[PDB]
Design a protein around this ligand. Sequence first.
Ligand SMILES: C[C@]1(C(=O)O)[C@@H]2CC[C@@H](O2)[C@@]1(C)C(=O)O
Ligand SMILES: [Mn+2]
Ligand SMILES: [Mn+2]
Length: 315
Amino acid sequence: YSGPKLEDGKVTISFMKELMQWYKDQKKLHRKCAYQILVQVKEVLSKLSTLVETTLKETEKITVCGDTHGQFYDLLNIFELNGLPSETNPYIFNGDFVDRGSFSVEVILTLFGFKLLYPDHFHLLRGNHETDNMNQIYGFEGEVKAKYTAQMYELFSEVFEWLPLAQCINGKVLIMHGGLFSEDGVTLDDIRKIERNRQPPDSGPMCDLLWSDPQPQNGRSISKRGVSCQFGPDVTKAFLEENNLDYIIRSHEVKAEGYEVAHGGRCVTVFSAPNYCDQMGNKASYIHLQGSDLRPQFHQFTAVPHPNVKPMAYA
Ligand SMILES: C[C@]1(C(=O)O)[C@@H]2CC[C@@H](O2)[C@@]1(C)C(=O)O
Ligand SMILES: [Mn+2]
Ligand SMILES: [Mn+2]
């Protein structure tokens, strides 16, 4: 083994640079190093609140990315366009890191590595795909079994259970993978209090955060996905008012331009997997927020080449 090695058992910036190159070249991180990253990141995530609360000073910025779905070469493109993560270039990845794309292992270990390196500036929120039933079907479990072992997969599953479910910036912008709730009256404190270290239930606030979608018409509808609901602009308005928020950013749906702003400004979708599954032909985007101006600034990007491995090859 002549690949990336942790230094004194810990992630460093040089390790991360070596790792990204190793992965670009289609090589595998030694199982012992992967294991160390997973055990250490479990510890880090398990100490976090279900609702991560982050203050952005006036001179600070943050980048918000939506679904990446194992599109590792596109993840590298994000970092090339927007800079590597650091204490002055923080990131939030809003769920759905794995499944569908066939470089899910490379995406997730790169994301976990950066979480370890910059724990206060590199944020990961759970998506509906960071779950066992989804991973069993949509590629990630197959990919981990192919590259490592079932035991390694079990560890990933345990780590995913500790991913926080939402993040609030400056008490003004709430970020979650899916969206808002099937019942009125949910508060930020209710979210804080969710016991998240589990597979999601098929109903209730944890399910909704990971699974719901906005709809343009007022009200709520039964979801076509078979779980959670669609929520209209009236739902969003009431939730923002009760919680003293400005707007929400969510992900969870492909958008041709990589983003959408619904509910009159109140419900933003960001989606960061361009040409999704090598077929959708969509642009992707990421968002910049600034401490002095939390209105979203969209930055679009398009797919880059990757090795010839088909989406879902491991599913
Ligand atoms: C189909 C998708 C998936 O994750 O299964 C994939 C494509 C759009 C979005 O990401 C999706 C609907 C989601 O679950 O977030
Ligand atoms: Mn998704
Ligand atoms: Mn999703």
